[PDB]
Ligand binder design. Structure first.
Ligand SMILES: Nc1nc2c(ncn2[C@@H]2O[C@H](COP(=O)(O)OP(=O)(O)CP(=O)(O)O)[C@@H](O)[C@H]2O)c(=O)[nH]1
Ligand SMILES: Nc1nc2c(ncn2[C@@H]2O[C@H](COP(=O)(O)OP(=O)(O)CP(=O)(O)O)[C@@H](O)[C@H]2O)c(=O)[nH]1
Ligand SMILES: CN1CCC(C)([C@]23NC(=O)c4ccccc4[C@H]2c2ccccc2N3)CC1
Ligand SMILES: [Mg+2]
Ligand SMILES: [Mg+2]
Lengths: 167, 167
């Protein structure tokens, strides 16, 4: 059964863990428990194909930034997450992108830009600004909410589709 | 930082995932989503020492039995879980222990016998009988409930102490 190694990356607090847990447990976690490194395996059906998703939920805290090199070498696709109510998290996206491109030594790494917390009314990042950044990278952009589940399945399925295109 | 590699093993349905999620997230999962393989890295203080617990939540489905060798080699201590309302799960304990002993090529591997679902009134395994089994193995026995949190911290901390007391 085809396996896809997906890695969720982004600034500390954007909702990487909440997105992953919502996808896998169908449960929204309101608590903030900073992650070191957690991994999940889930069997799903995407476009009629049964897939195994190997999801790595990474640390946004810079304390654990030395762990990035190994997960970027093995990761097949990257979910690059920012929060729509956190200007700094959007600015931190390009750093994750640049690091992934450098480790992979490639410009066409499967990625999806995710603008999380779209359920909140405190927006500080314009959807247009995010769409434009995704165009400069030539990657899809999807807005999500780990709380309401808006766009969650779409963000992970799209990333799997990006890996399939690249194979 | 001292790291402890803990592996949660047992028959399908005993509550391995519910115990792990209760330990880490302090809530009880009513849903039954069979596990393939999930991992968690969590920082905790045990006996005044800051520890890193690497917890592997394994598959109880007998279909994934070929995956056991690798996690038994890597694992330092094993939480051997049965459910007090499932006699097959209690008898399956012997098979998990014999497999661990064989991979490790040792008779004294850190283990803790856990009798989960102790909140339920449908008991089929007497506490005395579980206690006698743990005594024959020379390991600690604790009854737990992933629902009420009874014995959960004690089961994981005791296993860390077994790894520590073995070193
Ligand atoms: N309203 C709302 N809150 C969210 C959403 N996603 C995550 N959160 C909240 O933001 C906080 C951080 O979520 P978390 O999943 O821990 O973020 P993280 O990026 O994994 C944190 P770390 O990098 O340290 O592991 C939590 O309080 C969580 O409930 C969302 O889509 N909507
Ligand atoms: N009453 C009660 N129910 C529990 C307890 N622990 C787990 N359960 C329940 O048993 C079912 C299976 O729990 P789960 O944690 O998935 O068990 P598992 O051993 O991980 C199953 P698998 O081996 O396939 O991964 C769920 O309905 C869950 O709510 C408990 O301590 N008490
Ligand atoms: C016991 N496994 C549990 C799964 C694992 C955490 C991790 N899976 C790997 O195969 C692997 C191999 C080398 C380095 C990193 C990894 C991880 C990885 C990266 C990207 C996406 C998923 C994911 N799964 C590794 C440890
Ligand atoms: Mg996290
Ligand atoms: Mg499980």
């Amino acid at each position: 059964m085809t396996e896809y190694k997906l890695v969720v990356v982004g600034a500390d607090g954007v909702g990487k863990s909440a997105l992953t847990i919502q996808l896998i447990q169908n449960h929204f976690v309101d608590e903030y428990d900073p992650t070191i490194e957690d991994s999940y395996r889930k069997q799903v059906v995407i476009d009629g194909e049964t897939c195994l998703l190997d999801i790595l939920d990474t640390a946004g805290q810079e304390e654990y930034s030395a762990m990035r090199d190994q997960y970027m070498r093995t990761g097949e696709g990257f979910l690059c997450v920012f929060a729509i109510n956190n200007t700094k998290s959007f600015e931190d996206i390009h750093h994750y992108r640049e690091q992934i491109k450098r480790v992979k030594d490639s410009e066409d790494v499967p990625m999806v830009l995710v603008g999380n917390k779209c359920d909140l009314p405190s927006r500080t990042v314009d959807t247009k600004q995010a769409q434009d950044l995704a165009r400069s990278y030539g990657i899809p952009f999807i807005e999500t909410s780990a709380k309401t589940r808006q766009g969650v399945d779409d963000a992970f399925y799209t990333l799997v589709r990006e890996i399939r295109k690249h194979k």
